[PDB]
Symmetry: C3
Amino acid sequence: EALQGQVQHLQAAFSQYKKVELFPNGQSVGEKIFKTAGFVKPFTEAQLLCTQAGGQLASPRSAAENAALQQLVVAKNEAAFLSMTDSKTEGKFTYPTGESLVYSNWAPGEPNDAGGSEDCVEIFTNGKWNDVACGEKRLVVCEF
Amino acid sequence: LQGQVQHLQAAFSQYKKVELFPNGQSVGEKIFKTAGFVKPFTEAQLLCTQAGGQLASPRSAAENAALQQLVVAKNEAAFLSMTDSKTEGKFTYPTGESLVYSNWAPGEPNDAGGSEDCVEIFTNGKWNDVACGEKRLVVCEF
Amino acid sequence: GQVQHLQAAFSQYKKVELFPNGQSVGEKIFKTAGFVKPFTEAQLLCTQAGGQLASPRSAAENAALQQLVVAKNEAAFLSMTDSKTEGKFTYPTGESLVYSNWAPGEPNDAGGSEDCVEIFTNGKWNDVACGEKRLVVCEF
Ligand SMILES: [Ca+2]
Ligand SMILES: [Ca+2]
Ligand SMILES: [Ca+2]
Ligand SMILES: [Ca+2]
Ligand SMILES: [Ca+2]
Ligand SMILES: [Ca+2]
Ligand SMILES: [Ca+2]
Ligand SMILES: [Ca+2]
Ligand SMILES: [Ca+2]
C-alpha cells in the first residue's frame, strides 16, 4: 500500500546514513560492525567502555573480520586490543563466552606469555596478533 | 512486510549503539553528543542549534549523570543551555521556563563579579554559574 | 503503523550523526574525516566508504561543504579533475562541470601540473597539485 514505499524509502535513507556513520572510524563485515574510539586505553578500561556502549572489544572470528579490523588499526597506526584473554587458563585464549578461539593470526613466535604475564591480545597494522600485558595502552576498538 | 520492519529495527538498534560510541549518551528519549572541543557559549549554542538541537539541558539526575560521563571522558567541563541573562538570579531553559532540576556546587550559583549568567557542569556532575565568554566543552542534546 | 515511531527516531539519529562533522543539503550528505590526505588516498577512502569525494553541484551544496572546511580551517579536495583533458574539469562520471566557484585567476594549471581542485574557507575553488595534502570530505 502506501506503506510498501515508506519502507523502501526508510531503507534507502538508512542505507545512506549507514555509510555516513562508518566513515571514517567504522568497518562493517557481514553483520558485525567495528568502531574505534580513536584513543588508547589499558585493557580493563577499554573493555569497560565497549561493554557500557552496548558491545564488546573487537573479536575477529575470521580472516575477513580480521582484515576489516586491521584497516582501522592501519588508519590509526595504533595496535588495538582484542576481547580474548587466557587469564583463567593460561595458554588457553577464549572469548567473553569462554569458548576457545575458532580463529587466530599469531605473529611468529606468539603467543609466548613473555615474562609469564601476558594474558591479553593485540592486533598490529599487519594484522598479526601478539599476546601482551593487559596493563598496556592500546587502541580501543569495539564490535557491535 | 511487518517482518522486514523488525529487520530494519534490528539494523537500527545496532547503528544506534555504533553512533553513540564513544561521544554519545542516550537517556530516555534524549541523546547527548559532544563535539569533543571547547567553545564560548554563543558559538557553542550556535553549533548546537544549527545541528538541529540545543545545548545540553539536563532535567533530571539521570540525564545529569549521563551528561556527566561525557564530561568525565573528555576531562572538560561543559556548557548547559540554561542562563539567567534576562532575569539575573533566575536561570531558565531556551523556552524561558524555570529550572525543574539543578545540581549546584557548594556556594553556587554566586554570579561572581556580577557577570556569571551561564552554567557549566563538572566531572563530578556539579554545576557552576560561569562567565559566558569562557571556553567549555560543547555538548548538544537531540 | 509503528513506522512514524521509527521515522522520528531516525530523524533524531540523523541529527546526532551529522554533528559535528556532517552537513546535509538536499538528499546529499557531506562528511569529513577530520584529517588531510593526498588526492589518491582521499579518493580511495571515500570510495571504499561507499561514496565519493565532495562534488558540489550548486551554490547551496558548495555552501554546506564550505562550512565543514571553515570548521576545520583546512581546504578540502573535490572529486573533479582535468586529468584526462587538460583544462576540462569533470566529475567521476566524466561529464563537465554544471557548477563552479573558481577564485580570481583560477584554473591556471600552475606549473602545468594542477589537475585537482580544492575548496577554501571562503568557498572559492583552486586547481591544485593532486600530490598535496587536503582535508578529506566525502559525499553520500
Ligand atoms: Ca597468565
Ligand atoms: Ca598468558
Ligand atoms: Ca607476546
Ligand atoms: Ca546577569
Ligand atoms: Ca547571573
Ligand atoms: Ca559561579
Ligand atoms: Ca593536466
Ligand atoms: Ca590541469
Ligand atoms: Ca591553481
